[PDB]
């Protein structure tokens, strides 16, 4: 799955 | 200030993107989608399951 971490 | 999710609110820690191209949502925030760690392979929101 794709995630990101929020900046 | 852009917002998403099943909750509208703006992004915050890890979040989980829709395989479905056409997903209104795109993204949602792990805990909102029941999730500890990120799923192995595709994975399709709540709402693009049961569309
Ligand atoms: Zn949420
Ligand atoms: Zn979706």
Redesign the pocket.
């Known amino acids: 799955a794709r995630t990101k971490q929020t900046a | 200030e852009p917002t ?4 509208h ?1 703006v992004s915050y820690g890890e979040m989980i993107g829709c395989d479905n191209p056409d997903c209104p949502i795109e993204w ?2 792990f ?2 989608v029941d999730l500890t760690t990120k799923p192995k392979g595709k994975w399709f929101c709540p709402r693009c399951v049961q569309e």
């Open positions: 998403y999710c099943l909750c609110q949602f925030h805990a909102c």
